[model samples]
Target: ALERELLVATQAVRKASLLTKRIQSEVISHKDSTTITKNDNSPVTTGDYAAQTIIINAIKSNFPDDKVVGEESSSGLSDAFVSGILNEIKANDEVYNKNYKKDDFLFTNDQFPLKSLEDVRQIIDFGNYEGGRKGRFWCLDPIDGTKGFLRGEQFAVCLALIVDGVVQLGCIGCPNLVLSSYGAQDLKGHESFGYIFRAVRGLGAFYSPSSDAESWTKIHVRHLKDTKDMITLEGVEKGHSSHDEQTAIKNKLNISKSLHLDSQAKYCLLALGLADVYLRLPIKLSYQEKIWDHAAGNVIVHEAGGIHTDAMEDVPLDFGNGRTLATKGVIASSGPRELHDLVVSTSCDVIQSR
Candidate 1:
């Protein structure tokens, strides 16, 4: 039913992912001078703005009536910043057009080569919609891990289609994630292509190389033989999640190995069977996780035969509650039912004890 929606979303995310990859390489070459810190102190870059504009413009062109709840907005953008973003878009669009055929895209190509600064501003501002439970909307995290992008580690271009508050489709494009015959490898600065993970509600999750749009392989979470062997994952930014509490839970579960990653790429890792579990414990009680951060990954993990829910309670993350999730913290596991239960119970015990 949602094949067209999935196609559009996949292409949009791919374009944004490649655009961000270019911007990342440029920033690294120039020694990182284009970064802008948000009011909340998080970093934003030309890649972030350009990626958001690209994805939102694609969504608007394809589904004109659909609202977008995107992370970046154009409210405080300066002229120089806007021009930088525009320049990236122009350069990326040229490459995109030359490399990909017109049939590969569901939306019109003329949307890019934006007319003016005002045009770019309006397209970006289209993402400023307040999400709700009433209708369909596109949720986008143009750059899911800005710090990871700056560090040239791992980042994702994430997009999802939510209809009446339920995610029906999800697409995450990890430009630095290398999946070879051996296994999933981190960005080692040698690979020319990355991976794209996508899922449509009942159709199941699938993956493809970012370089090839035609090849897709079905993916599933790794079935755990023992909880002790579980390879858990968490964010690299200690401030974003409670590493101490995660350590407590890991100790209680007797899980020996854990991998620290940034962005929704952790979700992709779990979906690809490269990792076994993911936990995002809250750093503060008042802090809320944004919808854009989890929306795309939630469906992808669930479709890959993983269980995703809140750490405090075994409930799905609520996406209808405006921009931020109503849930507390996230706990996802590729489970045999028993392991998921154990992890959830152990997390509760550890959190309460803390």
Candidate 2:
């Protein structure tokens, strides 16, 4: 039923991923003047705006009535900032025209490449759809882990399709993700190459290098018999997740090994069986996780034989509660259910004691 939606979503994410890769190389990696601070004091770069514009443009072009709930908006953007993003979009279109096969892209060449600041604003503003529980909407995090992108580390371009509040399809593009079973050390000095991860509910999870268009390999999470042998994954930013809390949970579970990564790419690793568990314990009691951050990853983890749940309530993540997840913290496991229960119980116990 979702075959067309999946194809369009994958193409949009891949195109945006390529654009973000170029921006990362020329703008972000060089510390160029293409970054701006959001109202929350978080960094939003030209890559973020440009990627969101591109993805939303594609979605709107293919599925005109589909609304989008994206992380970026066009408010407060300066003329120069808009121009910067337009320039990057133009450059990306040029490369796409010259290099990629035309039929592979869902949109035509002229559909993007904003001609003016107004064009950019309109396209970016199209992402201001207030999400709901009744209809379908696309969720986008143009550049998840913007801090990681600034540091030349891990990040992702994430997209998902939600119908009636459930994630039906997910697509994530990781420009810096290494397609290997080895640990983070393998990423040292590695040239940026894009890897795409996707999932369809009731189907399965699949991934492929962006270079090889539709070629996909089925992936499954690794199952561990013992909790002590499990390797947990956490976010690198202290503010994004509580390190001490994660440590406490690990100690309680007797898990001695953990990996720190940025963005939803952690979910990709877990789906590929490179990591066993992923926890995003709340750093602030009032903080709510945005739907874009975990929507795509949530479907991917579940389709890959993993489980995603609320850390406090130990239930499936509720995506229908407007823009933010209606759950407390997140806990995803490459599971056999028993392991997931153990982790959830331990997390609830630890979080309550705090």
Candidate 3:
């Protein structure tokens, strides 16, 4: 049952990811066509709404009663914005056309007995669930790393299944991540982008070139004998995590520099063996992390044979508590068991004491 669910959900994300890529390149640009929606909230708003709608429609088609904790919701949206969403959904793209299917309803009893736009609004609104420790639900960040997406850099469409509050299955379609190894500061070349990374509990991690791309490649973290050999991955937006704290953590860990990338795709770097450690030290105590932000990445790291936990202790990230991780911050390591232990010990001391 879980395997099949992962398959459908992964396929659904493939469609959503493809749709988002097109919008990022074409629909998001200025009407003058000179540039994309650079530094504008317009792309983020439309892409987020459209991607969530498409993703929700796919999940609900197979499992309607299951809940969704998605980022975007339809509430008092402007007509132009709504039209942009509809136009994107109504495109002739085969992936979108094939994936977005409404669940068949029996003859109606609702106030607005209808079809069409109602499905769009309701599907996006399906994300408005008070997720908690209970039955199954999906957590989605339709467009993770909005800053990167707008800037034509890295971004991801993240989705995962939580059963009784633990991340069961996770998948993320990274439209901009190269299917190859992570290296060199500069990103150049055609084949350097597009990856669909996924993981199932105890099943290990795997990546495909695209949804329709050939073959699934099983991936594992690179084993390292020395802690000093480790590399760090930090969030692109400095506001999201404390760079100064991460720098301190790195100083204690004996690493010099880190990969400053956007989105949960950082998890992909660790899982793929391209990087060793990721730190998301909290920038503020008042800031609670939304589950959609980390659910998929948490499972992927674990399945790839690493560990993800709160920065304070080795206690695993609790996904079932509610919509946010109940911890203060996140720490992930794809290093040797001892190296992981050392980092955790030092990280706890450094972060908590500060």
Candidate 4:
């Protein structure tokens, strides 16, 4: 079946999902401030690398012919990673993820127990396969919110399959997702619902979770014209992506009325209809959104009866080019065209089109 490629990707995403949850309750619980393996203010912890290694390795071995465009390439990690990145990747950071470590790097490798940062970098670069001409490509964001992963808040293992420049299928494993009774504080693992959102080209969107998959509900967007009724998902570091405007936009969108989450889990919130829209306006020069960051979530929104588009709306996003940052910023909406237009118009800090 042609859908098998999607299925493999889904399985890999789900694997990372299950594994990330375990690391959250286990490894991250033991962390010190020094665990910031990534320099983006948000730390890509051991949980991030371990999950990346397992998921991407699974996909590569199964689909050797596919190219993978991933977030954490290792050129920035160490001196030798250049053979895989610099020699081929061209004019990018030579230092990629130099401080990768597995949660259990001690006993996992048997004869080659991971002792240094080098082993971790190779594993973190799991999705750095060659691009171009390859008929199908996979995009991965190993840990969507490294900071939240550390805080033991919501985060995700994001993955997608792109074929000839189009996202054919997507699977996002959200381990910390609590779809029910989120307002009840002191969760202490009492929260129920961990979801897997999936979309196949023509099949539309479907979600399964730790709770129930047999029902297989389809997700759609609501216009939430009342603004007051429109719950939104926002970035944790709202101050960085937008200083005062994030709050201004939140009030304008009436999104202050909703849940605040980390990473693309914001995308998942909108996909499931618990929230109606998501707006991310990246700051100038400092933070250029990556293609891998949206590759999976953007498709999950569209296939769920919503629309995912950049402000300029030229091309949705092309994995072929590597990063989507050049596109200004992102706006995903339910069925409503008016509100989306308002968002693109209301912002001055970041715009729809570059």
Candidate number with greatest lDDT: 2
Candidate ordering by lDDT (highest first): 2, 1, 3, 4
Task: Tell me model 1's lDDT, rounded to 2 decimals.
Answer: 0.84
lDDT of 2 at 134: 79
Q: Number of clashing residue pairs in every model?
A: 0, 0, 2, 9
Model 3 C-alpha lDDT per residue in residues 178-202, reported as the tens digit of each score:
6444672322322423778899988
Tens-place lDDT per residue, model 4, 1-354, is: 356666566666655665577567554656763254556555655556666665665565556445677776555444443232222211111121122122212212333223345654555565675444347778788878777777788888888877776777878878887766453222233233377777787777877763332345677655566776776556777643654455677776666575667878778778767777676666664555776678788778887777776533423545555445456567776756676666656664334333
lDDT of each: 0.84, 0.85, 0.76, 0.62
Candidate 2 total steric clashes: 0
Better model by TM-score, 2 or 3?
2
Candidate 1 structure quality by residue, lDDT tens digits, 1-354 = 797788788888888877887778787666456788889999888888899888887887787777998998888888887998888988988887787544756544465435578878988898888898878999999999999998888899999988889888999999887655225553333244477899999989998777665668899998978768889989999899889999998888789998887899999989989888898988787888999999999899989999988888777788888899887899998976778778887777777886
- Candidate 3: regions farther than 4 A off: 31-43, 92-115, 179-181, 184-193, 211-214
Query: Cα deviation in Å at residue 321, candidate 1?
Result: 1.2
How many pairs of residues collide in model 1?
Answer: 0
Structure candidate 3, residue pairs in collision:
165-320, 178-192
Worst 10 residues of 4 by lDDT: 88-97
Which scores greater on TM-score, model 2 or model 4?
A: 2
Model 2 residue 84 lDDT score: 85
Write down the worst ten-residue block by lDDT for model 3.
105-114
